[PDB]
A = this chain, B = another copy of it.
Amino acid sequence: KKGVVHGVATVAEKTKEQVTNVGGAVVTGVTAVAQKTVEGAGSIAAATGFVKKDQ
């Protein structure tokens, strides 16, 4: 076989799950948040997939 890419690729065979992201966010897993009280300014309380920027 042969494969040429520029990016971004995701090549496989017999694969159960695949995610390709250029961005950007993709949420595919089970996630449960139970919460009672959040205060303070400003607190990130429970972040699973998380990125942050400034300029």
CB-CB contacts below 8 Å: A1-40 with B: 1-40
Apart from the given pairs A4-B5, A21-B25, A53-B55, 6 other A-B contacts in the complex at a CB distance below 8 Å: A12-B18, A19-B20, A21-B24, A43-B45, A48-B49, A50-B50
- How many copies the complex holds: the figure is 6
Asked if A53 and B52 make an inter-chain contact with CB atoms under 8 angstroms apart, the answer reads: yes
CA gap between A54 and B33 in the complex, in Å: 27
Give the chain B neighbours of A26 by CB distance below 8 A.
Answer: 19, 21, 25-28, 49
User: What 7 A-B pairs have minimum CB-CB distances, sorted nearest first?
Assistant: A32-B34, A25-B49, A27-B49, A33-B46, A40-B41, A42-B43, A28-B29
CA gap between A16 and B9 in the complex, in Å: 17
